[PDB]
Write a protein that binds this DNA or RNA. Structure first.
Length: 1089
DNA sequence: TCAAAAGAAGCGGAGCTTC
């Protein structure tokens, strides 16, 4: 079969033969059902080029009757030029093989018997054929691989993952808090070797259309395609389709020896016809294209497995979730597209980005951040227009072309729309392609329709819609439309009348919006002005939406899901700030915020921080030098952060804002040091920006006061702008030269001998490493520490205990799985080494890996809820194989061998379960529950709803929130950890893993003098802890369900979900409610007893 | 801290080494 297709390859397809053995045929086999239309073709480049030569030829080749209408003349012409370029890549490749065969007589040595086809750099020799006194590529495999390479070149960038700080830190080996400025931007805008080759390899093997033989070594099944990828990547470097950049980390940190390769794909012109249809190749080659747009009733198929987690199948309920979301039709809203278009890319960059930095006369570091904001917008813009260019071809009226999007479930159970730039992920696109729409009767402003319309406009305009009633927001929206926004409204009216914009459109918009500016705000100004000129106001069609938005969702979900003790009154008040109201029939978040408590969970945190902060000062009341450090750190923040306000007499006031991100990531398991670095970065980002202001201040006057140029705004006078300049230089002084150190459980100031000193240069200015670290330590001990205590005091110690036990449990388990998998890989390799057909370079077969994985089932690597499946340890590390998989023909581009294997979890257990059983389970529920809202856009912790169904959809959302609150993540972990605890043997563990386990289950002291039996007893103690917590959470949930509850967590609209609790707890203080709930609690315990 | 990983290259044909 396979030999009949490739009968001329070099070698014998028998692992037991003595001479050259051909590992291509030994590792692959023809599939049952055709996957690629090139297998069997003696020249895929020519055949595919012919197939692309005309719509008629295309249709026949793909055995389809009609072809994408986007496949017209211009596109056809661009694809002809691209095919000719494919021949260029092919020629480069053929020439590289020849050079490889000549150097060090590899070719001659290979023909004489040297098994060079097994070297990390010669696996491609498995696809060559004998030709005279040398070898040559098999044209079918080569060309097909080139076709794969062309598709990848056209759409790889758009499919890349977004790299945050964590990623960059892991890649570069530089602490996340110390990354220079545009470093993250530089690495997010390029691909690492692994990222490039991996996606390229996947594409190549896919186009080859064969199947992996389960009994073939991974070194070949994965190696041959990866080796082909490396060569194609090298070829693209030679052709300049791809730019390679070797980043030397020794400059950005003299101690780092890592030199990292970065790969960027030369972008095509935004107006290139290929963009209107960049999947023509993919769609001709693959019978089941996994890269295309979905129009009409061409619905996306349902992913069978969790994203990048083949070991986990999407449960039946999750599959139903995906199906519902993928069936939703999205539509282009022409007015917005025409607006973006009339404004133009350049002006949207000015308006929503940094618009033209050409005046490269602004702080060097600030300039790198501004450049990043521009990129995100620009790429976002071109991607939106490439999409409408294809849509446009589908029909005469682009507003009526239905659009479907593929989705998939992630590790933490979220339904992520696939693709970097889409409605779910890109704000710019979100306002252009919507699933929402409604026909409203706005003829009377007393109608409910108008009231929904106002809600939509107000929320888009940044009015805190969930903090007031419809009525009150109705007045606030009006005062704004007729106020600061009127000039922008009038302009939009003209735009929706003649199609033109003034020359000062950016200024009119920027001035009318102020900090309310955003893409959704542009939609609001657009929709209101459309309504104004509308002929028939009684039937206004708009995609404008209202989002049922979760209030402090993550922290509230955690409190609700993992608090496991008796009920507390602080807890009852605090949980009310998240939508759970006890004894208040039909109460809404709007009434709660305006009538009972105007402070949300972020504020409560900030207020607890302020108290814990004042407390810190007392413990050092006399220590003048410490008081001054705190005061200086507080002074620096007040100088640049809006959330801090030191006032005249010293009154310290804080906004809920400074606790937003920290409260959130502390729920995702973040450490204190990490939070501190985030805050520092905020400060520095603002300083760098103020440095640009100064530059721009003296360019506007060469004599402006240094102080006046930097604080002319914040100040009210001269000597005043001098007081601020005095605080700055002094704050940067004490903060970079002196840092707090915790000794004997007490704080002590220590000099760094690396303080900031010298004449400030507003353009070169930069807060370096040793100075960033200093700010970091001050921020850590004088702000974050008290903030962390405040957070804990707010969410509850009980919840913190649960997350600790959860982390510990999931960690310990991840360790064993990891150590065991690694060991059993070492045992098998130990056998293979005794086999004459095997070689040190080959790894194990997929079968041998599937067996090793199976040998771990009894350790319960999976966590089940009944509707969701989690595999916390799952990952793709290079640690298991610990070896190169393949290199290019120049002995470079050495790609490490990655294997799907369990790894240490760290704190990952927390985010996985809180997100998974929290917002993950909720949205899943919301899209599959009886009467599931239709035509919405779900973004994890919020849902966009068309103006016509905001009431019922919001209520269903709150109901979904309620059923997700019936979850018990700890219980699920208990179930898994308990099975694990009865099959694990801590003596089979290396001292390495045995030590990590001790860290989680044993208190620092007992670690050294700890036997296997010691950590086994402790680990066993953790089982009981979880068992107890799970039992508590379960009682609370049942008890809480017997009382009358009103839930409005997905606030905005004011449609709370009523649980019909029979027991009435109205007319009671939280204290009374706690005692009553505990009576039902103790009572329920007895029941079980 | 979750969402996905992750250094390059001589000599020799793996994996130690130096930057």
């Amino acid at each position: 079969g396979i030999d009949a297709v490739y009968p001329s390859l070099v070698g014998t397809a028998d692992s037991k033969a003595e001479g050259i053995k051909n590992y291509f045929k030994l590792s692959f086999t023809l599939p049952e059902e055709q996957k690629s239309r090139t297998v069997g073709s003696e020249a895929p480049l020519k055949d595919v080029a012919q197939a692309l030569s005309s719509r008629a030829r295309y249709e026949l080749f793909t055995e389809k009757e009609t072809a994408n209408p986007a496949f017209n003349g211009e596109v056809i012409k661009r694809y002809k030029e691209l095919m000719e370029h494919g021949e260029g890549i092919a020629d480069i490749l053929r020439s590289r093989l020849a050079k490889f065969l000549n150097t060090k007589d590899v070719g001659k040595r290979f023909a004489q018997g040297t098994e060079a086809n097994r070297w990390v750099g010669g696996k491609l020799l498995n696809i060559v054929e004998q030709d005279g006194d040398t070898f040559k590529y098999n044209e079918q495999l080569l060309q097909t691989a080139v076709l794969a390479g062309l598709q990848w070149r056209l759409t790889a960038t758009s499919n890349t993952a977004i790299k945050d700080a964590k990623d960059v830190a892991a890649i570069t080996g530089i602490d996340q808090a110390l990354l220079p400025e545009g470093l993250v931007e530089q690495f997010d805008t390029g691909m690492t070797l692994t990222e490039a080759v991996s996606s390229l390899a996947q594409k190549i093997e896919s186009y080859w259309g064969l199947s992996r033989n389960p009994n073939a070594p991974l070194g070949y099944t994965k190696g041959i395609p990866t080796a082909m990828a490396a060569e194609i990547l090298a070829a693209f470097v030679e052709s300049t389709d791809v730019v390679e950049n070797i980043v030397d980390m020794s400059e950005i940190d003299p101690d780092n020896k890592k030199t990292i390769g970065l790969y960027t794909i030369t972008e095509l012109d935004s107006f290139d016809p290929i963009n209107s249809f960049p999947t023509a190749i993919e769609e001709a080659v693959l019978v089941n294209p996994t890269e295309k747009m979905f129009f009409g009733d061409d619905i996306p198929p349902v992913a069978n497995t969790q994203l990048r987690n083949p070991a986990v199948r999407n449960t039946p309920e999750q599959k139903a979730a995906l199906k519902a979301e993928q069936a939703t039709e999205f539509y282009v809203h022409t007015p917005m597209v025409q607006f973006y278009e009339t404004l133009g890319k350049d002006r949207i960059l000015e308006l929503m980005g940094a618009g033209t930095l050409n005046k490269e006369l602004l702080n060097d570091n600030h300039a790198k951040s501004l450049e990043g904001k521009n990129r995100s917008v620009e790429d976002s813009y071109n991607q939106l227009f490439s999409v409408i260019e294809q849509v446009r071809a589908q029909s005469e009226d682009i507003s009526t072309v239905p659009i479907h999007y593929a989705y998939n479930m992630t590790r933490v159970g979220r339904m992520q729309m696939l693709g970097k730039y889409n409605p779910q992920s890109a704000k710019l696109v979100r306002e252009a392609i919507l699933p929402t729409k409604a026909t409203l009767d706005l003829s009377n402003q007393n109608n409910e329709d108008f009231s929904a319309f106002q809600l939509g406009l107000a929320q888009a305009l940044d009015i805190k819609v969930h903090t007031m009633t419809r009525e009150v927001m109705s007045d606030e929206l009006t005062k704004l439309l007729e106020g600061n926004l009127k000039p922008a409204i009038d302009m939009m009216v003209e735009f929706n009348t003649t199609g033109s914009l003034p020359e000062n459109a950016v200024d009119v918009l920027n001035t009318a919006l102020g900090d309310r500016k955003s893409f959704v705000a542009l939609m609001a100004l657009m929709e209101y002005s459309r309504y104004l000129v509308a002929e028939d106001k009684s039937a206004f069609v708009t995609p404008l939406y209202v989002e049922a938005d979760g209030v402090t969702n993550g922290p509230i979900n955690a409190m609700m899901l993992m608090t496991g003790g008796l009920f507390t009154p602080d807890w009852i008040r605090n949980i009310a700030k998240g939508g759970l109201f006890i004894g208040s029939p039909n109460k809404t978040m709007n009434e709660h915020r305006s009538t009972a408590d105007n402070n949300d969970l972020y504020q409560a945190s900030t207020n607890a921080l302020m108290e814990s902060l004042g407390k810190l000062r007392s413990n050092y009341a006399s220590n003048m030098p410490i008081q001054s450090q705190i005061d200086s750190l507080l002074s620096l923040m007040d100088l640049f952060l809006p959330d801090i306000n030191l006032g005249e007499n010293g009154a310290l006031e804080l906004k809920r804002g400074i606790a937003k991100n920290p409260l959130t990531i502390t729920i995702y398991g973040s450490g204190a040091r990490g939070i501190a670095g985030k805050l520092v970065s905020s400060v520095t980002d603002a300083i760098y920006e103020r440095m640009s202001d100064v530059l721009k201040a003296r360019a506007k006057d060469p004599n402006i006061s240094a102080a006046m140029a930097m604080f002319g705004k914040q100040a009210a006078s001269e000597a005043h702008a001098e007081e601020l300049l005095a605080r700055f230089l002094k704050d940067m002084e004490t903060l970079t030269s002196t840092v707090p150190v915790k000794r004997k459980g007490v704080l002590e100031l220590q000099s760094t001998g690396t303080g900031a000193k010298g004449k400030i240069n507003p353009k070169t200015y930069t807060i370096k490493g040793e100075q960033l670290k200093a700010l970091q330590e001050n921020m850590l001990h004088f702000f974050v520490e008290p903030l962390r205590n405040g957070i804990t005091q707010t969410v509850g110690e009980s919840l913190v205990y649960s997350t600790e036990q959860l982390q510990k449990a999931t960690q310990i388990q991840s360790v064993v799985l990891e150590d065991m998998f690694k060991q059993r890989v070492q045992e098998k390799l130990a056998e293979k080494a005794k086999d004459p057909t095997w070689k040190k370079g080959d790894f194990l077969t997929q079968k041998e890996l599937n067996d090793i994985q199976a040998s771990l089932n009894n350790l319960a690597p999976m966590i089940e809820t009944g509707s969701q499946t989690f595999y916390i340890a799952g990952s793709e590390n290079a640690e298991v194989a610990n070896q190169v998989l393949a290199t290019n023909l120049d002995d470079r581009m050495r790609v490490p061998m990655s294997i799907y294997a369990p790894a240490q979890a760290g704190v990952a257990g927390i985010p996985f379960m809180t997100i998974g059983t929290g917002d993950g389970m909720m949205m899943q529920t919301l899209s599959t529950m009886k009467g599931a809202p239709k035509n919405t856009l779900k973004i994890f912790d919020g849902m966009n709803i068309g103006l016509n169904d905001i009431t019922d959809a919001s209520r269903k959302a709150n109901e979904a929130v309620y059923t997700s609150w019936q979850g018990n993540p700890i219980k699920n972990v208990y179930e898994s950890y308990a099975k694990f605890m009865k099959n694990v043997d801590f003596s089979k563990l290396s001292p390495e893993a045995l030590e990590a386990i001790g860290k989680s289950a044993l208190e620092y002291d007992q670690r050294e003098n700890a036997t296997v039996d010691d950590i086994a007893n402790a680990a066993s103690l953790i089982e009981r802890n979880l068992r107890n917590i799970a039992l508590g959470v379960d009682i609370r949930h049942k008890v809480l369900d017997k009382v009358n509850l009103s839930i409005d967590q997905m606030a905005a609209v004011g449609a709370p979900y009523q649980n019909n609790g029979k027991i009435d707890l109205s007319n009671m203080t939280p204290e009374q409610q706690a005692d009553e709930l505990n009576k039902l609690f103790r009572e329920e315990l007895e029941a079980r007893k």
